[PDB]
Design a protein around this ligand. Structure first.
Ligand code: NA
Ligand code: NA
Length: 158
């Protein structure tokens, strides 16, 4: 009833490669809130702005017991470089095969250049302590976004 998106059961057990060389899974986050923000490319203006905005709010996400994960299909090394340069204190998922992206249906098509072009659409989701996707933002506008996600999380966590 409260889910806005249904994920395949296997999604929760996908090994997610993180910046720093470890893996996580969504099921491993059971018992706490998780913010998952998908972005199209490491180290670009919009995606850097978004990451820095989430980073600045970590203490507020901590207050709510929540963890954050950023996701793109860039490599672990790209992610390590992005995290180190920007000072991010949360992990980035290297979803190189787009398995996590497809589960959340963030790979979108656009008819451009006389082609059918597929790419990551900037999107964010709130995953409850029991693994339900309870809020989604798609075609995300970076300005104000992390603030809006925090506000929604606080409203839900009650
Ligand atoms: Na960078
Ligand atoms: Na969770």
């Amino acid at each position: 009833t409260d889910a806005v998106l249904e994920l395949p059961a296997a999604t929760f057990d996908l090994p997610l490669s993180l910046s720093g060389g470890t893996q996580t899974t969504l099921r491993a986050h059971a018992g706490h809130w998780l913010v998952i923000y998908f972005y199209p490319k490491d180290s670009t203006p919009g995606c850097t702005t978004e990451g820095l905005d989430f980073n600045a709010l970590l203490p507020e996400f901590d207050k709510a017991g929540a963890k954050i994960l950023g996701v793109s299909r860039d490599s672990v090394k790209s992610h390590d470089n992005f995290c180190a340069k920007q000072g991010f204190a949360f992990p980035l998922v290297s979803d190189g095969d787009e398995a996590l992206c497809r589960a959340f249906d963030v790979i979108k098509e656009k008819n451009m250049y006389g082609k059918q072009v597929l790419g990551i659409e900037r999107s964010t989701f709130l995953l409850s302590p029991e693994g339900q996707v309870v809020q989604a933002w798609r075609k995300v506008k970076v300005a104000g976004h992390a603030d809006a996600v925090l506000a929604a999380l606080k409203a839900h966590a009650k």
